[PDB]
Amino acid sequence: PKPAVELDRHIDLDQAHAVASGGARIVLAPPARDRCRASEARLGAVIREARHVYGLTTGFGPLANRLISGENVRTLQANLVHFLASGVGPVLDWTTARAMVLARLVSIAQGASGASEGTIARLIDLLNSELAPAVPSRGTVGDLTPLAHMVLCLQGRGDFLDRDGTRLDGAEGLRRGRLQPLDLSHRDALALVNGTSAMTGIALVNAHACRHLGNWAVALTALLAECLRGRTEAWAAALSDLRPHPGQKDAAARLRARVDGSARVVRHVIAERRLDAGDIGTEPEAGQDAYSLRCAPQVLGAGFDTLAWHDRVLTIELNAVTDNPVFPPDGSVPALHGGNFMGQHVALTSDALATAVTVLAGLAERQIARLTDERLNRGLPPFLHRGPAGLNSGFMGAQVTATALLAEMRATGPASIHSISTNAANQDVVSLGTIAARLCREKIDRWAEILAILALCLAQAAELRCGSGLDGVSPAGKKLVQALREQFPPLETDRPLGQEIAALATHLLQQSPV
Template sequence: MPCLASSVDLGGTLTTRDIHAVATGACPVHIGEDARARMAASHATLTRMVEERRRIYGVTTGYGPLASHPVTPEHAHLLQRNLVYHLCSGVGKPLSPVHTRAMMAARASSLARGYSGVSAPLFDRLLECLNLGLVPVVPEMGTVGASGDLTPLAHVALTLMGEGEMWYDGTRLPASAALQAAGLAPITLGHKEGIALVNGTSCMTGIAAVNAERARRAAHLALRLSVLYAECLGGRLEAWDARFADARPHPGQKTAHAALQRWTAGSDRLVPHVQPPPRLDESQAVEGWLPEGECPQDPYTIRCVPQVIGAVLDVMRFHDETVTVELHSATDNPLVFADDDAILHGGNFYGQHVAFASDALQMAVVKLAIHAERCIARLTDRTQNHGLPAFLHGGPDGVNSGFMGAQVTASALVAELRTRAVPASIQSVPTNANNQDVVTMGTIAARKTADSLDLVFHVLAIHALALAQAAEQRGGTVLAGFSPGSRAVVRWIREQHEYLYQDRPLSPDIQQLSGNLERVDWDASLTH
């Protein structure tokens, strides 16, 4: 996506779209003077209290169940370094560079709130890595999301110390070599700087911020495809009348109705509604009974689009609001309140808000795939698709099966999504010698949602390819009668994937289109 600003101020007001832009490399980052002043005051307060040899968790004590052991300030470097070392225990494949950059941006935003006590050199190194394209290699598994995302953030901290591995210019290198190639030196962690880096919700929050933008695009794509689907089947406009949203004013449903009104404009393939309703035709009555006529309502895949996708939009709004608050939060422990000359020990690292929001978003995006799969099934079934070829095949009957295989793949993908949809946010497992006796699994929830979005876009890609085929079977290559918005969608697909004149392997088409669909802002692009 294009950057909405020349550079994102990670110490200012942020949106999930800002984090997505930073994560995907579309925007550089910086920090404003107000945030620098907040951090300097916090650092000065912490430094003074350490010099006064006060008891501060993780600064002059051990960690977790070992916090009862005091540690003198002279051992600060060893204390912070060993914290990072023992937490670097992650396993599994690396997080994607996008997710890792999102985590780094979210951590920088949290530190910039001015409650963490870190020094300017440490913070600047985090920004430099983002701007120079240095991406730590971070195993994806190992955090329970309770005392923050300790394990993945420790792997980030390790690379800033010149250990572990980083990607730089597309090459996976030892962190020391990557830093040297970029002209940077490893850092030495000062008082609280290890725990400030690792103790917080930034992994789950960064991934959730990326999920928010991906889900927004998927939902608005689903609205565009719903219009095209209704046009292919001669759907009725009546159920999409905006007055339904007046009668049931959920914000998401109102947004869905407005979008449907926008994208159906100019269509000659949708049945307009007439008020008052037509009178019964009693001319064929037999002994007072009337023969069967046409059904005055469409199936739910058309009729209930505002309610299905509207509800998804409302869940997205809840998720986005939750993650946005988290992006503006200090989430480590303890926190330094410089204005009050206070250091407080608490639990802002506990990621339950993001865990619940991520699980809710996963349910919502799975519903997008369920709706799309049912649309594909109806569109390819010659007993329900109003005269289109069976499975939308091209070429001679029998020897060409069209989208038969792709329709089965869509069904299989929905089954995959359903089996993965068990909430993570309630899977608490006590750990850390029962110090962490309830945990959130927030990062697992965010990762699961990210994985589900991958599959959702695969289903939407199959739906889009099938709809482009059906639209040309209805309206020819000129797409006669289709709305300008729908014609724009089909022509965009045709720039990349040709009409299925005869059977060919569709896996490359599906996977390529899935990635390309995700790169478009469907609420604002391809209007005509």
């Protein structure tokens, strides 16, 4: 059948991505259902008492000084969704749009938003269906715009996306997925729109992709060592112990595991060798590898530690109440007005992860550059070609493509530093977290393409170095090359690799080498 995620209070990143990718269905736990019914009742009382509350008895933003009569709240909230729907640009992908819906659902499930059962049910139904709302990616300063578009979609007034990205009109979407049109009550409108759900959704998909790409970065660094007689002593646990960064220790341990059983790497600690007068002279190779192999634990480790920080922060943000105003479950006050919708946390962690991704992509790019250079690849053909040299150039075109992809990645910097006072100075500081998360996603996509090129290069390199039988290659390495060859043939003669690179990249983002 299909796994089920029961949402109560906390959901971890793997559970969240499982639901967003449709791998698992979602159910609201009884305790959560009750907490929300209780909040629903609080919203009702707040409204009946005509309390001064943003979005219920006031205008929006700087127009909040304009009080609104209870008789016009329906209209007020209907216009809210309308004026906010000014987004433009390509729609968020299927998994990401759903991740956004999930993020808003989790914030609501904490029982402090006042959302009605129907509204909550509409979000759950969407997540359990095979559809995703079609929402424009640009327009917010960090996530009213994208969420307002989500609301319109859920009302059948906006397009839906199937798993392939094909769009369905509103009516067709509600029909096909057996979704009931969203019926907004009280502040459901503001509740569904005033949070950091878009950026959080984008970031959770980024987190999941990075985990897989990191596994490939490790698996490919290990295979590279098997193709260039790399020295395993640089990956010794003793070294990690002396510089105890969790990410480094992990990276080194994972690298060692990958080459376990290999007869292609060099396992001798050089210091064990005692020299005598006759040894003094120039040797063919230095006693240590170049940095793209020797410093892999330190570089990959720094990236893993950045991702770990990103995920710790994202875990808190995913399970937090990012809404304004909020209705305290204890009933201490009718409501609280603040800025829990300010996505500065995801903005800063997305920018940090973006930098780390660019650094790791640079490592793979240099690994490709070394492997394909006949002057540096220790005996392998230039650009790993097969057939007559000159007539055949092998991966020479692909090597340049890898460099081009990295160069483009570097052209874009952090999004967070560009805050600009807007909304008539009411929003004098903004996070741009959604932009930050999206820019990070783009870099992750380029990294997958660079790793894809490296993977194809290594499959060819392994066969050139060890024969089609991959003699001496570690079990893990053999399995990885064999799996690649199931879909990607050896480069016996020059051929267009563009489509294959793109195809492989798509795979890398969703599955790890095991």
